Amino acid sequence: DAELLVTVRGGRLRGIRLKTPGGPVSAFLGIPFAEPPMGPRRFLPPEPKQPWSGVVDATTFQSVCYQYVDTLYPGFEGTEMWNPNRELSEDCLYLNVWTPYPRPTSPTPVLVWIYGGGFYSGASSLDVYDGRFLVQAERTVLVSMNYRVGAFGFLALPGSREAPGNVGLLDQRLALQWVQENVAAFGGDPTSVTLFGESAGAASVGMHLLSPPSRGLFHRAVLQSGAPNGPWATVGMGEARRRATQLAHLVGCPNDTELVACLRTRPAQVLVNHEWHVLPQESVFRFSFVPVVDGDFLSDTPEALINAGDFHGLQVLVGVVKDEGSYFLVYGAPGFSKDNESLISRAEFLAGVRVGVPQVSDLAAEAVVLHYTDWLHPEDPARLREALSDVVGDHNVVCPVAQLAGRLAAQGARVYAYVFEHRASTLSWPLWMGVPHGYEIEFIFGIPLDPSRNYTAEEKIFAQRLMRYWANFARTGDPNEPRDPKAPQWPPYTAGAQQYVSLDLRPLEVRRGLRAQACAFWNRFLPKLLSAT
C-alpha cells in the first residue's frame, strides 16, 4: 500500500508493516543518516549522508557497529540477548523509526532511544529494543540509531585533528539533527522529542544535556541506570592518549598523525581483538574507549558542568534497578559465577573490592570495607556477596545517578526518580543476582506483549503501566495522568526529600532516599579522602 512509502530530505523509503496484538504499526528500519565512516573516515566525526537515487529498502535492521562479542557463557540467553544480531560492519551508521499504522494526522511526541553497553557494544537491532509495542500502545513515534562504539567511536589522541574523540557521541548528535529535519515526515513533533537510554546510553543522554550544541535538539531526558559523572563514563585526555598509543603498539603501529594513519590500515576485526588488553588494571565495570574530557563537546568534566549549570525548563526521569552491581561480578570478581551461588570468602571479598573500585589508594579501599562489611558477621559469604554487589552498583550507578538527580533538581530541573525492583519471571540469570542491571528494558519496551514470549499476564499489565508512565513523561514532563488524582502520585525527586517511587507489580509505593547513607560516602567523603591522601 501507500502507508509504507515515505520520502525524507534525502530520498525515498520503503518500510515494513509490523504486527502486534493491539494492532499493526509501520516501521522504517536501517535509514542511512551518515556517509559510511570507513577508510580515511575511521575515527572521524560523521558526515551527513548525501541524497540518494531510488528507494531505500528500509524493511530490515542494518548492520551492527564493530564490537567485541561476549563469550563468557556461550549460548546463554542472559548474555546472548545483548550480543549482535546482525553482521558486524564499519558501515553501521543507520537509524530506525516506528510510527502508528494510521500515520498520525497531528504532530506526535517522539522518543529516541540510545542503547547502552559500556561504550564498547550494543545495537539498535536488539530484540529488547523493539519499538512496535511502545508506539502501538501509546501512539508516539520512536527513533533509535546505531552509534560507533569501542575504539571506532571513542579512541582519542586529544588535540589531534585525525583522532579527536567522542565521535560516537557525535554520531548520536547527528541522528538527533536528523529527526529535527525528518521526524515530521512520519507524524513526529520536532518540538517535543524525549531522549531515553540505559547504562552507557543513559550516560550519553547526560552528556547531551551538558553539551550546548545538542541541548537544542531535545526537550526531555530519561536516564535509566546511568549517569555521565560515573567513574567509568569518561577519561582524561592523558589517559585517553595513553590507551590509544598502547593499542597501536599492540597491533604493531610505530607522532599522532602517523599513529592514526597506521590504525586505519588494520582490519576492524584486528582492533576489536586487542580492545580489552589496553586497560590499566584488571577491573570490573571499566571499558577502554569511552568519552574524553577534551574541551570539545565536554567543555569541562561532567561533574563540573553538572555543578555549575542551570537546568530550569528541563524535565528528567531517572532511576536504577534493585541490584545494579550483581551482573558485573561474574565478569571478573574472584569467586563469582552465574552457575553456583557465588558464596565468596572474606579474602575473595577484600580482593573483590580492589577490582570493583580500581585505582584508589590503600586507605580508600579500607574506607570501602569499613562501610560495607558487617562487623558482626565479617565472614558470612552470603553477606559478603551482597556487600560486593552493593559496592560495585553503588560506586558505579546509583550514587552517580543520585548525585546527578540532587543537583538537577536543586538547579531548576523537574526530576522524577524510580527504583525498578521486579524480577522478570523469564530471567535466565540465577536468583542471587536479584534484579540485574539492564532488566527493566524488556518492560519499558512492552516486550511481555509479544505472544512468542511467555511472560505472565500480570507482567503484561505491568509493562502497559510502565510504557504509559514513560509516554506520559515524554508528552508532559510528568509520568502521572493529569485527569486522575485517585491514582498514586509519583512525587518529584528533590535534594532534601529525595522521594522516589518503586516499580513492581504492586501499586506505586513512594520511598525516600536513594541509598543516601552509602552515597554520602561515595559522593561526599571519598573525594575528600583521595584529595588529602
Next chain:
Amino acid sequence: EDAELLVTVRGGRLRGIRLKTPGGPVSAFLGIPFAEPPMGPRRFLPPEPKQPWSGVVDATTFQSVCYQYVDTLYPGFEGTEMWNPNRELSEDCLYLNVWTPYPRPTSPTPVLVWIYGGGFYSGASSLDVYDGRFLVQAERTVLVSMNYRVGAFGFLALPGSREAPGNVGLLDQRLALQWVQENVAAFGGDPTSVTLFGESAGAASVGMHLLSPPSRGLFHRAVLQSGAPNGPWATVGMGEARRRATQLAHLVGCPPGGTGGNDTELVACLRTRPAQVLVNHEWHVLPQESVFRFSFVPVVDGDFLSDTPEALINAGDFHGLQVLVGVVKDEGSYFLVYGAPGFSKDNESLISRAEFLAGVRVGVPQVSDLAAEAVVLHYTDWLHPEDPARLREALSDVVGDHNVVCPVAQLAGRLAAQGARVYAYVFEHRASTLSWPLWMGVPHGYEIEFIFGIPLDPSRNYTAEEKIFAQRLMRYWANFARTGDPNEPRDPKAPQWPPYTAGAQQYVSLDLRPLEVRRGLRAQACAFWNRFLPKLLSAT
C-alpha cells in the same frame, strides 16, 4: 553497742559505727588513715604509709574530700549536686572506709573495693550514692572504698622529675589496696579474693591497675563500669603532661629559677600556691576547647604505665582473669551540657546542623579536619541531615561512642581473645527519680544508684519494681566477686548471661525486663573508632 565495732588494724585501734538498713545492720569503719597527709612538701609526691598511732582512732564519720573543682553549672540541682563534694575539702584526704556484715562472717569472705569516678578531677567515697551498707548487708561481702588525690594534686607531672613524677593518685589507690592486703582479714575479708569495681575514671583506674604488675598481686577480679584505660581522655603522653603542667605554673605565676634545677624550682613554687588557685586555673591548661577531656590525668611515664594502655592491652597477661564490663545506654548525653553549643538540661537542646558540626569539633577535639568530616559522615542521617532531634541524639552517640563505649568494647574483645573470662552488660533502665531531663535517657553514672542498692533506702522514693531490680543487680555483682560469674551458680530457669567473646560479642541488657542476650556492642560504629579512624589519623 557491741564488740564488732572495735577492731585493730596493723597501725592501731579503731572505733566503728553500727549502720542501719531495713533488712538489718552493718558495722562500718570510716575515715581510716591509710597514708601520711600529703601536705606541704608532700604535695605532688607519692604517698607514704600512715605511721602507727597510739590510742584509738575515731572511725565514726567520713573524712575529708580531696581538693577539687566544685560544679557551679546548675546550683542546687540534684543531678549536679549528687557528685559534688559533701565533706570539707582538704589536701588531708587519704583516708579509707570499710563496711562488713553484722556478726562478721565466720569464714573468709570476698571483698569488693570501690574506686570513684569523675574524670580524675573530682569524686569522693563520702558521696551518698557510694554508701556501701546495703549490698554488704544484702550479700554478705566486705566492701572497701578509698579517697585518692584528684586534679593536679593527683596527676600533675613533670616526667623525669623527683618532685612531681605523676600518677600519685594511682599510687594513692595502690597503697589502699596493699592496705586491705594487710588488714581486710581483721574485718572478715579474704585477701586472696578481692574484686575491684569502679565507674568511668574509677573504671579507667581499675583497668590501669590490671596493666601495672605491682597491682595485680593485690586483686583477682575486676569490674569496669562505663570506663576503660584506653579511652582517649584517660591518659596523656609525657610531653603533653609536661606541657600541661608548666602552663599551670605560668598561669599561677611561677617564674623564678636561681639555682638547682629548672624542674625542681618550678614545682617548689607550685607547692607554695594555695590549693584553690590551682583548682581555679585547672581547666585552662587543656589544649583545645573540649567535652569529656580533663587536664590532669595519668601519664604514660614508663613506670606505672610502661606503655600506652592500648599497647599494654594487646600483649597482656590476662588468662585466668574474670572481668565484668558494661556501659549505660546514653553515655554521651551527660557531657554535652558542658560545652556543646545549644545544650542545656532545661532546654530540649534541639540543635541546628551548624551547631552539630561545631559540636563534633569539641567532642572529638584532638583530630584533623579530614577525620572530623569522617565522623560527620557516619553519624549524620543523610535522609534527615537537618532534623534537630536526630542531630541531638547523634552528637550524643559521637561523644558516648568515642569516649566510653568503643574503648570498653575494644578492651573486652582483647581481654577475651587472650584468655580472660569477660561478662558484658548494657544498663538501660531510667530511674523514676531522674533529676536530669528526658532527652538524656540513662546518663553516664546512673547505674551506680542501683548497683549500691540505694533503692532500698526508705528515705528515697524508688518504686517497688526498682528495689527488686537493685536486689538483682546487687546479686549479679556479689556473685561475680564470689565466683567470677554473675549469674546463679546453677539456676534452672533464669536466663543465662553468656560470657562476652571477641567473635560472638554477646552482652546482656540490665533493666526491669529479664536478661536480654544481645549481640554486638555497637559493632558497626566502633569499627570506625577502633579500626579505621587511627589509620586515617596516622595517614594524614
